[PDB]
Amino acid sequence: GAMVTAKKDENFSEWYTQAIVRSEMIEYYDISGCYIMRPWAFHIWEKVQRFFDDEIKKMGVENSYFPMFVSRHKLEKPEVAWVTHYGDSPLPEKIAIRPTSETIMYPAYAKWIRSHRDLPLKLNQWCSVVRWEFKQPTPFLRTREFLWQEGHTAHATEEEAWELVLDILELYRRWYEECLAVPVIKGEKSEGEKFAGGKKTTTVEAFIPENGRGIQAATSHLLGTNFAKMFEIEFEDEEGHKRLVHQTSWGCTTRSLGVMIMTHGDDKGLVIPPRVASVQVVIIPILFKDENTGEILGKCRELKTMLEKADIRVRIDDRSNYTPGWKYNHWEVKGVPLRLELGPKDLAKGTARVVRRDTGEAYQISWADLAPKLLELMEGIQRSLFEKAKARLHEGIEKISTFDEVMPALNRKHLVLAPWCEDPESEEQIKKETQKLSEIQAIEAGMTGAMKTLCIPFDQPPMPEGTKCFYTGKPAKRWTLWGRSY
Amino acid sequence: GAMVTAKKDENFSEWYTQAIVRSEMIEYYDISGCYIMRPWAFHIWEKVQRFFDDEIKKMGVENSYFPMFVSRHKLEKPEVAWVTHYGDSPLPEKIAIRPTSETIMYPAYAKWIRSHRDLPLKLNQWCSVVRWEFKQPTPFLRTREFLWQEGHTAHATEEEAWELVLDILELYRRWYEECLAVPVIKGEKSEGEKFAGGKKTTTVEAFIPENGRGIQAATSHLLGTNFAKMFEIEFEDEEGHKRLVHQTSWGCTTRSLGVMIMTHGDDKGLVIPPRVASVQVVIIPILFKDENTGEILGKCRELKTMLEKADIRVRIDDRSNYTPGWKYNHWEVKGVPLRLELGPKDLAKGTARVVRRDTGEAYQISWADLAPKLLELMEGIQRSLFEKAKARLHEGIEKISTFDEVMPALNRKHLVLAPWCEDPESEEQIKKETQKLSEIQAIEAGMTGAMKTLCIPFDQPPMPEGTKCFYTGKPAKRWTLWGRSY
Ligand SMILES: Cc1cc(N2CC[C@@](C#N)(C3(C)CC3)C2=O)cc(C(=O)NCc2cc(F)cc(-c3cnn(C)c3)c2)n1
Ligand SMILES: Cc1cc(N2CC[C@@](C#N)(C3(C)CC3)C2=O)cc(C(=O)NCc2cc(F)cc(-c3cnn(C)c3)c2)n1
Ligand code: PRO
Numbered sequence: 012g013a014m015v016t017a018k019k020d021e022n023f024s025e026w027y028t029q030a031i032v033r034s035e036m037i038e039y040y041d042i043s044g045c046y047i048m049r050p051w052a053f054h055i056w057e058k059v060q061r062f063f064d065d066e067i068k069k070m071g072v073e074n075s076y077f078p079m080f081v082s083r084h085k086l087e088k089p090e091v092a093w094v095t096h097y098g099d100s101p102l103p104e105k106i107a108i109r110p111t112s113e114t115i116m117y118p119a120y121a122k123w124i125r126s127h128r129d130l131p132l133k134l135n136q137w138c139s140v141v142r143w144e145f146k147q148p149t150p151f152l153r154t155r156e157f158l159w160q161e162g163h164t165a166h167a168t169e170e171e172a173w174e175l176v177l178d179i180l181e182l183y184r185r186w187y188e189e190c191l192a193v194p195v196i197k198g199e200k201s202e203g204e205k206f207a208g209g210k211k212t213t214t215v216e217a218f219i220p221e222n223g224r225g226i227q228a229a230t231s232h233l234l235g236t237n238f239a240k241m242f243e244i245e246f247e248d249e250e251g252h253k254r255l256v257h258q259t260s261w262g263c264t265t266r267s268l269g270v271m272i273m274t275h276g277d278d279k280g281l282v283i284p285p286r287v288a289s290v291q292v293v294i295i296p297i298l299f300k301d302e303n304t305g306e307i308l309g310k311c312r313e314l315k316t317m318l319e320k321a322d323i324r325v326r327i328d329d330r331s332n333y334t335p336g337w338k339y340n341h342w343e344v345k346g347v348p349l350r351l352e353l354g355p356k357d358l359a360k361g362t363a364r365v366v367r368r369d370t371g372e373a374y375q376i377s378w379a380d381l382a383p384k385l386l387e388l389m390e391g392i393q394r395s396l397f398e399k400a401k402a403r404l405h406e407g408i409e410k411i412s413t414f415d416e417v418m419p420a421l422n423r424k425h426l427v428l429a430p431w432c433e434d435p436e437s438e439e440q441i442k443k444e445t446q447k448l449s450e451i452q453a454i455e456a457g458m459t460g461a462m463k464t465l466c467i468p469f470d471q472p473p474m475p476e477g478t479k480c481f482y483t484g485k486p487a488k489r490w491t492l493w494g495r496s497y
Numbered sequence: 498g499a500m501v502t503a504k505k506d507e508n509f510s511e512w513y514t515q516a517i518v519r520s521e522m523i524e525y526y527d528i529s530g531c532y533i534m535r536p537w538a539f540h541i542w543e544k545v546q547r548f549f550d551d552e553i554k555k556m557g558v559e560n561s562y563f564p565m566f567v568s569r570h571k572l573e574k575p576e577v578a579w580v581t582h583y584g585d586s587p588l589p590e591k592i593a594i595r596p597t598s599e600t601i602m603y604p605a606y607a608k609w610i611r612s613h614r615d616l617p618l619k620l621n622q623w624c625s626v627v628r629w630e631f632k633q634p635t636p637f638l639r640t641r642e643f644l645w646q647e648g649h650t651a652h653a654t655e656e657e658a659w660e661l662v663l664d665i666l667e668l669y670r671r672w673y674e675e676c677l678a679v680p681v682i683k684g685e686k687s688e689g690e691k692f693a694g695g696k697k698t699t700t701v702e703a704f705i706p707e708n709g710r711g712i713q714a715a716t717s718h719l720l721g722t723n724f725a726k727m728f729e730i731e732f733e734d735e736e737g738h739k740r741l742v743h744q745t746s747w748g749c750t751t752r753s754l755g756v757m758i759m760t761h762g763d764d765k766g767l768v769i770p771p772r773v774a775s776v777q778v779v780i781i782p783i784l785f786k787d788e789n790t791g792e793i794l795g796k797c798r799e800l801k802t803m804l805e806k807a808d809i810r811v812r813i814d815d816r817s818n819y820t821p822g823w824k825y826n827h828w829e830v831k832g833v834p835l836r837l838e839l840g841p842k843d844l845a846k847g848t849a850r851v852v853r854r855d856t857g858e859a860y861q862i863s864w865a866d867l868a869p870k871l872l873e874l875m876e877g878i879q880r881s882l883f884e885k886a887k888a889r890l891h892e893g894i895e896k897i898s899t900f901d902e903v904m905p906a907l908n909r910k911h912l913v914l915a916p917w918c919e920d921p922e923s924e925e926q927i928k929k930e931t932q933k934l935s936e937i938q939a940i941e942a943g944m945t946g947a948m949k950t951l952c953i954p955f956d957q958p959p960m961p962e963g964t965k966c967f968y969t970g971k972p973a974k975r976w977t978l979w980g981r982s983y
């Protein structure tokens with residue numbers, strides 16, 4: 012036995028640790044800020060990787076592999092780990108482990124691009140990167156080493172590069188919403204939060220109700236011609252004039268797994284959406300001592316064969332030395348979306364008993380109907396997980412008009428949607444003021460408190476003219492989404 | 498235009514550089530010993546990765562991801578890169594970048610394994626590793642950073658672990674011989690060349706005729722209980738006695754791509770076996786100015802659709818601004834195994850002209866027969882590439898009886914197969930003596946010269962009794978394969 016015992020709504024940090032440890036998703040490691048990704052989590056990564064990989068291939072993006080090292084000269088042209096020695100011997104100049112690969116890839120782009128016939132150039136890589144913050148890590152969400160993909164494209168015009176930025180952002184919306192059943196908000200980052208050196212940064216943002224925090228889920232940047240100028244990346248049109256290329260950068264990490272875990276989990280542990288579950292259906296035979304155990308197990312194998320013909324991912328837990336109750340809890344903790352139970356009474360009726368992980372509802376299904384009924388049940392579970400999560404997202408955002416509605420909203424663990432003048436100085440003033448007010452409240456009470464922009468959403472509600480900015484009183488420009496954050 | 502101009506049989510090093518650069522497989526990089534893997538090579542890696550990944554999954558191996566860092570304490574429990582600083586700040590203790598992950602994974606294994614019901618434990622990861630030799634690199638073959646997979650299993654008995662070692666070695670034989678059409682020899686490493694800390698190391702070895710050198714293609718180790726003792730990895734049987742587990746480690750790298758390139762390439766450039774070619778068939782329309790170009794291109798699209806229904810990977814090069822001659826050479830350099838040409842005379846007859854890359858032989862195929870004929874042609878090209886390579890392997894090995902047949906054989910750029918007493922001191926004496934004799938010959942002549950064991954092959958020819966060892970005159974034990982090497 013091993014059950015989750017912290018409650019998700021009472022001690023959220025302990026609950027999250029129990030849910031990912033007791034389900035065997037992660038293991039700790041002697042170097043702080045790094046975690047081991049065990050197969051139960053890694054299978055989910057492989058599934059979303061396959062999804063995204065297939066979609067970018069349809070766009071003409073190709074995979075590649077660039078070195079993990081970058082020279083001091085190129086990098087600084089900051090949370091970076093430096094290699095200064097090979098064995099006993101001092102490197103003649105220190106080299107960094109990649110935090111991101113713009114400065115690794117771009118010198119090569121400048122060599123490869125000569126003519127408009129070389130554009131567009133579209134590359135991606137799957138690798139890990141290192142960002143060495145000396146603050147406390149969170150499994151999946153903030154770690155010193157993490158797996159990601161990063162794509163990098165170059166175009167003859169700004170408009171084509173922007174079109175690609177938005178197409179990729181839509182793929183990230185599908186990664187979260189269609190595979191992981193996590194609702195996200197598309198938007199533009201503020202000038203203070205956009206990618207250093209870029210022109211415009213787009214994002215999809217997620218929300219964690221139990222601590223009130225927004226979290227950036229993935230990112231797609233219009234670099235414009237800024238990096239082209241730094242690295243001298245130019246092409247000749249068909250008339251022979253040299254022009255800078257226009258570039259994009261975009262990435263998504265194993266952070267997505269953590270967001271999925273927090274979104275769907277419950278007091279019993281993980282709940283994995285059917286579309287990414289490596290086991291969608293666990294078959295548990297009931298194995299009384301005084302029964303025809305061979306016949307029961309034979310029928311479980313037949314059912315498995317039948318379900319796999321419909322591309323359902325099935326595992327039979329025929330372990331003799333554990334009870335069905337033990338098995339129920341074991342696969343509940345691991346988040347398997349459907350359990351199928353089969354005992355001598357079911358065999359006698361030609362049915363199976365099926366229990367859905369999200370709600371506990373049980374069904375009796377004839378064997379003839381099993382494959383289509385289970386297909387529709389998984390699609391219902393997927394949809395239900397998304398819709399419930401989406402309603403929590405919408406309950407979690409307060410539309411406000413002025414600044415002293417902020418702290419009450421933040422104390423409800425909500426995000427705020429507010430008209431903003433988008434002046435860069437005001438974002439830093441707001442972060443400092445909300446941090447300060449959070450400190451005072453902590454002292455009245457017996458993990459940063461600051462509120463920052465999460466994004467300026469693509470979906471703008473009506474902006475009546477004359478609407479003033481909630482903090483400066485200046486004319487508002489757009490509705491901006493703010494909250495505490497990761 | 499861009500043609501290979503160094504001849505493979507005259508300046509092999511220049512030829513190999515031209516073949517991988519002009520085909521856009523690799524790009525140089527500012528940190529020596531590291532190379533960029535561009536898509537044309539990376540697609541081949543993805544193909545063999547998919548092959549091997551599917552086969553180990555059938556064995557119950559699961560993928561995982563362990564950190565790239567290892568603490569000094571665990572590592573030293575040597576060509577290793579040390580991180581000693583994050584930004585400006587000194588790490589309290591230096592940490593190494595993984596050269597291999599036994600010391601990273603094994604502490605976790607000791608935590609995870611408790612009972613015989615936890616065995617066997619079978620994990621793999623796809624990642625890169627760093628081995629920081631300060632000698633001159635060779636693209637694909639010997640580099641400071643390379644991609645690989647490494648698998649690690651633990652078993653309740655030696656016999657099961659050995660059975661797994663040999664099953665994996667057979668997968669590596671299939672990786673080389675069935676995907677890459679490269680012949681390899683299975684064998685056991687000598688006691689001096691086996692994995693440090695292991696019990697027995699098995700290998701598949703390849704041979705490069707143009708420089709006479711053997712090269713280890715992949716490796717599968719019986720670690721036995723040695724690492725179990727170091728890391729205290731124990732299980733309880735069903736009677737409650739603690740026993741050490743028995744372990745295996747195995748890996749294969751992007752070195753395989755380089756071996757494939759050297760094996761099949763010719764004076765025109767790369768030749769890629771059909772089973773791993775990302776483009777198997779390139780369709781080149783003939784586009785005379787005074788022709789119905791629309792009809793020709795329409796038929797090329799129809800042919801492409803028809804071939805892809807048979808799972809043939811097809812690209813149409815309909816570029817207007819290059820000649821067919823230019824295109825022929827461009828895709829020859831890149832190693833595409835089949836070219837299909839279509840002009841107005843072919844359209845008028847309902848045929849296409851097909852040219853095979855390995856031999857230059859051309860065929861006229863009716864459109865109705867195209868899919869099955871091309872399928873059989875690709876299988877013939879694959880087989881032909883393997884069989885020709887296998888005959889070069891067999892021409893390259895001399896069976897000898899005594900030591901002064903060694904240097905003449907080595908001067909023919911051959912490997913030698915010799916009866917050996919398998920005493921460890923004699924291997925080091927032989928390496929020093931052959932190195933010395935090679936130096937003298939270099940001075941008479943106007944990249945190490947030493948001969949070492951490559952492996953003790955599983956396929957042993959007859960050993961008449963009384964046969965003495967070719968170097969010590971002591972009783973021979975087994976036939977051993979020796980040569981200059983990478
Ligand atoms: C997994 C992951 C994911 C992400 N991000 C960044 C945005 C992005 C998105 N979308 C990417 C990269 C895809 C574009 C994403 O996924 C960032 C980090 C990270 O910043 N790690 C360092 C670290 C270690 C650490 F121990 C602690 C902290 C730490 C503690 N408190 N604070 C304030 C920081 C930070 N890590
Ligand atoms: C790609 C790759 C592959 C391999 N191996 C090793 C065996 C194996 C097999 N089978 C593995 C790892 C799978 C088990 C394989 O693939 C080794 C190296 C390597 O040793 N790199 C360091 C280096 C850098 C460098 F610039 C120069 C040298 C150098 C120059 N002269 N000499 C004598 C060395 C070495 N690299
Ligand atoms: O780190 C980032 O945010 C961008 C997107 C992936 C590559 N660099």
Ligand code: PRO
Pocket residue numbers: 597598599646647648692716746747748749
């Ligand atoms: O480096 C090696 O040879 C073994 C096999 C892969 C992991 N370690």
